[PDB]
């Protein structure tokens, strides 16, 4: 996250870290046994880390649960990043409490102008690199669809939205991928892609989760 603030330990209780010997992507706990992330984060051998603040220190609220199954969206296109969403089932159910909690799925798509919370452990610099070890937070509005198609001509599908600032300076960044965009207490987006980080007229692009709610429900009802 670029130009954000330190969230504070366990203040974003649905935030997970996907680990394969190192943190490589964020994710969101949607019930005690299922995580949703970005399909471009797909990897074999995922361990899900819950209750994290400092990802390099065991602080006491962590639960490390390995994944038993990963399901990439059946129409994921890695070239265009359309349908960049994946479900991960935990081998056993997480123990839910004030610091490890699931986030609700939307019953409605969020509108442009809605302020949201984006969070993750990704790069905090738009030019160069510096990875934080504690979770970083950023409040950003959903952008109108026409300013989104104007920043990314020919690249925005109906399954994507832009969120952030056309002046730049604040944005999600590498390593924030798969992470949550929560608006009004509901998961509305997944950190998906963009052109660099915090650049002028190049806002973050996010998977539009409200389009996938029935695929998510049906898939967890059957797996
Ligand atoms: N600024 C958008 C970021 C670009 C890196 C990958 C996640 C999304
Ligand atoms: Ca830790």
Q: Is 62 annotated as a binding residue?
A: yes
User: Residues with Cβ within 5 Å of ion ligand 2?
Assistant: 52, 54, 59
Ligand 1: which of 171, 199, 202 to mutate, most ligand atoms within 8 Å of CB?
Answer: 171
- The data reach a resolution, in angstroms, of 1.8
Return the DSSP state at 1.
Answer: -
Cite the residue boundaries of each domain of the chain with CATH code 2.40.10.10: 1-12+103-210, 13-102+211-223
Q: Answer yes or no: is the C-beta of 179 below 6 A from any ligand 1 atom.
A: no
Task: Tell me how crowded residue 46 is: count the other CB atoms within 10 A of its CB.
Answer: 24
Could you confirm whether 32 is annotated as catalytic?
no
**Bridge partner list, 166:** none
The answer to whether domain 1-12+103-210 has CATH 2.40.10.10 is: yes
| Separation between Cα atoms, residue 13 and residue 16, nearest integer Å | 8
Q: What is the side-by-side order of every strand in the sheet holding 180-183?
A: 5-6, 136-141, 115-120, 180-183, 186-193, 204-208, 160-163
Q: Is 33 annotated as a binding residue?
A: no
How far lies 50's CA from each of 35, 128, 147, 186, 206, in Å? 10, 28, 35, 19, 22
Which architecture, in CATH terms, is 13-102+211-223?
A: Beta Barrel (2.40)
């Amino acid at each position: 996250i670029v130009g954000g603030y330190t969230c504070g330990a366990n203040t974003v209780p649905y935030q997970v870290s996907l680990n394969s010997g190192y943190h490589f992507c964020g994710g969101s706990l949607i019930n005690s046994q299922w995580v949703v992330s970005a399909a471009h984060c797909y990897k074999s051998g995922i361990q899900v880390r819950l209750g994290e603040d400092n990802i390099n220190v065991v602080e006491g609220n962590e639960q490390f649960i390995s994944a038993s199954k990963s399901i990439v969206h059946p129409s994921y296109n890695s070239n265009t990043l359309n349908n960049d969403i994946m479900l991960i089932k935990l081998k056993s159910a997480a123990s839910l409490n004030s610091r490890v909690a699931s986030i609700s799925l939307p019953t409605s798509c969020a509108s442009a102008g809605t302020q949201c919370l984006i969070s993750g452990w990704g790069n905090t610099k738009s030019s160069g690199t510096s990875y934080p070890d504690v979770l970083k937070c950023l409040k950003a509005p959903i952008l109108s669809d026409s300013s989104c198609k104007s920043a990314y001509p020919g690249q925005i599908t109906s399954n994507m939205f832009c969120a952030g600032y056309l002046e730049g300076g604040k944005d999600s960044c590498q390593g924030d991928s798969g992470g949550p965009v929560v608006c009004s207490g509901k998961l509305q987006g997944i950190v998906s892609w963009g052109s660099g980080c915090a650049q002028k007229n190049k806002p973050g692009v996010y998977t539009k989760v409200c389009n996938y709610v029935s695929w998510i429900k049906q898939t967890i009802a059957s797996n």
